[PDB]
Amino acid sequence: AYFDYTSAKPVDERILEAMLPYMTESFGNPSSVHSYGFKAREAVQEAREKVAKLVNGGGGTVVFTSGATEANNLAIIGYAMRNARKGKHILVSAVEHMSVINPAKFLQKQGFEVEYIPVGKYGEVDVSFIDQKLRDDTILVSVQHANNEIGTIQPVEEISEVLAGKAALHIDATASVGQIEVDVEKIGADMLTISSNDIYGPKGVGALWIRKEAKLQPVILGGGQENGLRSGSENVPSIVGFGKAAEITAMEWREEAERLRRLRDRIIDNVLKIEESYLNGHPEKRLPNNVNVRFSYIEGESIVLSLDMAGIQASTGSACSSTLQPSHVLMACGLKHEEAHGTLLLTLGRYNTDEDVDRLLEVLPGVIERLRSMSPLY
Amino acid sequence: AYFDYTSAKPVDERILEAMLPYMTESFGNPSSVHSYGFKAREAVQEAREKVAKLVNGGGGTVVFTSGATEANNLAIIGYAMRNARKGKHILVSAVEHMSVINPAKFLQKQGFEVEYIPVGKYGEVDVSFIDQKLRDDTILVSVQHANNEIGTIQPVEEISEVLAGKAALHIDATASVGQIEVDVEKIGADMLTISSNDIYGPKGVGALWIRKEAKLQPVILGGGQENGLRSGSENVPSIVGFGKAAEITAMEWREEAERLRRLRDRIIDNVLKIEESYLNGHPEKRLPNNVNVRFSYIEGESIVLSLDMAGIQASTGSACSSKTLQPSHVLMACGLKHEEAHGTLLLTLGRYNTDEDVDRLLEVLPGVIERLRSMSP
Amino acid sequence: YSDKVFDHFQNPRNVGKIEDADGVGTVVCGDLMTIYIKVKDNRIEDIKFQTFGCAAAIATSSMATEMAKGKTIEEALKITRDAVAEALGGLPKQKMHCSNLAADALRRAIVDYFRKNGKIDKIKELGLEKELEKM
Ligand SMILES: Cc1ncc(COP(=O)(O)O)c(C=O)c1O
Numbered sequence A: 001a002y003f004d005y006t007s008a009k010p011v012d013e014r015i016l017e018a019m020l021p022y023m024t025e026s027f028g029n030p031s032s033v034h035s036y037g038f039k040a041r042e043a044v045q046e047a048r049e050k051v052a053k054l055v056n057g058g059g060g061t062v063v064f065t066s067g068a069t070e071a072n073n074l075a076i077i078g079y080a081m082r083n084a085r086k087g088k089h090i091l092v093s094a095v096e097h098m099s100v101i102n103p104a105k106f107l108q109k110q111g112f113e114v115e116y117i118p119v120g121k122y123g124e125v126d127v128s129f130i131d132q133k134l135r136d137d138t139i140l141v142s143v144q145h146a147n148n149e150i151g152t153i154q155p156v157e158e159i160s161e162v163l164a165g166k167a168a169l170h171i172d173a174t175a176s177v178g179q180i181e182v183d184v185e186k187i188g189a190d191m192l193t194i195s196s197n198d199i200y201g202p203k204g205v206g207a208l209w210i211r212k213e214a215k216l217q218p219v220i221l222g223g224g225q226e227n228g229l230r231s232g233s234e235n236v237p238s239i240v241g242f243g244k245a246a247e248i249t250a251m252e253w254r255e256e257a258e259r260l261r262r263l264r265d266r267i268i269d270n271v272l273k274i275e276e277s278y279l280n281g282h283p284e285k286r287l288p289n290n291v292n293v294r295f296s297y298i299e300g301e302s303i304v305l306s307l308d309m310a311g312i313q314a315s316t317g318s319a320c321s322s323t324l325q326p327s328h329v330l331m332a333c334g335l336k337h338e339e340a341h342g343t344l345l346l347t348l349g350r351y352n353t354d355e356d357v358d359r360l361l362e363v364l365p366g367v368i369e370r371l372r373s374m375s376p377l378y
Numbered sequence B: 001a002y003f004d005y006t007s008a009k010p011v012d013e014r015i016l017e018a019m020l021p022y023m024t025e026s027f028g029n030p031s032s033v034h035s036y037g038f039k040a041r042e043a044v045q046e047a048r049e050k051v052a053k054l055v056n057g058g059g060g061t062v063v064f065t066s067g068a069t070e071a072n073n074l075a076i077i078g079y080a081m082r083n084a085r086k087g088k089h090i091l092v093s094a095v096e097h098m099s100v101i102n103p104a105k106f107l108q109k110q111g112f113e114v115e116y117i118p119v120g121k122y123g124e125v126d127v128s129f130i131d132q133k134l135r136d137d138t139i140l141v142s143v144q145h146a147n148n149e150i151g152t153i154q155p156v157e158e159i160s161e162v163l164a165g166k167a168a169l170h171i172d173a174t175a176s177v178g179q180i181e182v183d184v185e186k187i188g189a190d191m192l193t194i195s196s197n198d199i200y201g202p203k204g205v206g207a208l209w210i211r212k213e214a215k216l217q218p219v220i221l222g223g224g225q226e227n228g229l230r231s232g233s234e235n236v237p238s239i240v241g242f243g244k245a246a247e248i249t250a251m252e253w254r255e256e257a258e259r260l261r262r263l264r265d266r267i268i269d270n271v272l273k274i275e276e277s278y279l280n281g282h283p284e285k286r287l288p289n290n291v292n293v294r295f296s297y298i299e300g301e302s303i304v305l306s307l308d309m310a311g312i313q314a315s316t317g318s319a320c321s322s323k324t325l326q327p328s329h330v331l332m333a334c335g336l337k338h339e340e341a342h343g344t345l346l347l348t349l350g351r352y353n354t355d356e357d358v359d360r361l362l363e364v365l366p367g368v369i370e371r372l373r374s375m376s377p
Numbered sequence C: 001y002s003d004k005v006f007d008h009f010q011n012p013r014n015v016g017k018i019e020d021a022d023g024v025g026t027v028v029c030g031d032l033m034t035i036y037i038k039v040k041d042n043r044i045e046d047i048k049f050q051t052f053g054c055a056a057a058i059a060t061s062s063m064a065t066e067m068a069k070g071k072t073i074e075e076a077l078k079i080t081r082d083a084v085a086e087a088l089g090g091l092p093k094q095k096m097h098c099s100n101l102a103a104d105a106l107r108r109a110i111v112d113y114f115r116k117n118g119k120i121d122k123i124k125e126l127g128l129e130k131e132l133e134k135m
């Protein structure tokens, strides 16, 4: 029973089929001026449009990167550097993925001023901080659509109004694309981060989408592929796969997320009967695929490994599973170091069944009991 | 008849056979502390070792990248940024790939003094220029092992000796792996770039070998994978394929190399026996897979698309095909007049090249050249 | 990861609390542990443990208490972090502090038992003065 979907996802069989011919028969390089390269270019172009179509991204550009991490690096460093003549103040959310938080920390070493936006007990950004700390010199604000640890969905449409086209708005959509509607014009984004594997395409590819006019400095220098914004011969097979995943997600995402929500709820309603258990992140404005619970008196890695020995895959924000520091997200919500130790994160996907849940809910309570009965803390 | 192996190669079928399970059955993330994490974690480390074994890499560390391009970005930018206090002087060969020449140019912008090592007629870096210009404040030298453009093999053994303890030595080994012996201790590499696709593994992954106690700043920032030098969730399948290809290249290159040298030789003898043909780069000290001749009487893209039409996938340094519209930097550096260089043919040979493929080009090429110069200004 | 570590984690030995225990020893991350011993003729007639912490915490606590059971006291003070790391089949770095955890809770238990039975002299004997003070 694999409930660790937000750390890795399998590649959908239909994506693999789209990919394989590009790896062995049409392995041409898009820059080549012959048949083999021309086929190669049609393929990248089709993929580009399927990714753009997925997020209603016609009024902007898709740039293929090696993943959400690079995409984020490029969004933050690429944009700020090229735009520093118009100001140097930046707003970033306290619960962003480290591929946002670390690049902002790099800009802090390069004469940029970065303010990190607090959140509340359920992990939603504080919009009135944004509106209070917005200044004529603020050029960028980076907030995620949704949070992949606690499941919480962010007030991005609200955020877009406040900004009022006075500072560029970056949105990491890594957790949202496939779970909830991702419409760049509806959420007023200027840059969007997309992950292939998060929608069941190959690992090691992603895109940053960039509104027309938003201008950026590159990070990966060399050949000038991606119109000068990302160099290296294009990874055609992955891009095609990424494209096939976008087409599938567009056609199937709604029914899938409704199903996962229903399974999410059965989990939460059952898990939470257990003496001393708590849901982290919002109880409703929450990704259909996320259950994040904590259990008093016990430690998260132990829950995780117990589960595994039953054949159940899961995840924890405990210090014990890293570094040795707990989850920065949990800290920001205002969990104490004690609370964060007993964390269990179960995230759902395309190959889950009611039977997976059956199995989980007959196994868990025995685990929590077995660990509790040894905790000096019980 | 595919003669463009250095632009892109097919993935080897065995590489493929080893990639799939990790896409569908064992799709776990190496950071996970459960069985699927554990398998993925063993799968990655075994590849890392197979890659280290390829270039003799025990006294060092393999860092996975999204490809050569990134690995060069890491070598130059990450090494120079982290070492700047030892000095800010940098030596870069004039015929490096652009993924080395561009980041250096970034550095010049950032205050670093970069000098470009000249080459002779066959594009071979001047080992003497490196002797007399290497200052006390030199921290990094970057010289490719071989040129994928013109085939020339650099004197890396002798360059490594000109140094000795002074500046770290970066070597781009993209052209060379699977072609000629690549040994980090023998060429004296302080850093070494490796390309998966170039050795029949997948596109989208590559590596930087880094000698123990050379220190770099990372480029890709975030989650702390690759021991803090390259964040992001490991592309387990790609890395597996990369290892698998590493394991075949160790066990097959000596021979495949001979086979190709033979084919190159045949090609060499006949193309050269044509109206106004010159051979670019060194004729003897050259990769088993590089034929690149130039013609006075024509343009390159023409010779290329005229070949495509016969069923021949080739490449050109012709300015026409460059989107910026400039001719090859690699060729200008040798000394060619922008005009002379315009009509050049490049023919990268590879694994699935056979005798019959070679006999086709020899039955096709002469007409292509003749019934094209027959319409010349 | 580690081999017999799985077996002591999933099937732990001597979990529990001891009423009218003869010695109770107790110890940067989130690992807290106590050991309980009953002592008859200079032996550990019984040992039970309670720990809160990672899988290696559990494993080492299990192993340590299995190692000490029915042993003389001087035989038990011989149960260093390494005799337990090795005992299981070793552990990886970073999680090795969790072996120090168990070996320390056991020492303290033994040091508790001496401080309660006026055997303060043996505390000196015997190498364990420093750990009484830091308690
Ligand atoms: C010498 C050399 N270095 C670097 C590269 C870059 O490889 P990629 O474009 O796949 O990153 C190439 C090939 O393009 C090359 O020939």
Ligand SMILES: Cc1ncc(COP(=O)(O)O)c(C=O)c1O
Residues within 6 Å of the ligand: A006, A007, A067, A068, A069, A070, A072, A097, A099, A144, A148, A172, A174, A175, A195, B223, B231, B232, B233, B234
């Ligand atoms: C919100 C968010 N952003 C970015 C990433 C980066 O993912 P990767 O490690 O695939 O680059 C992740 C993890 O998947 C994530 O959860």
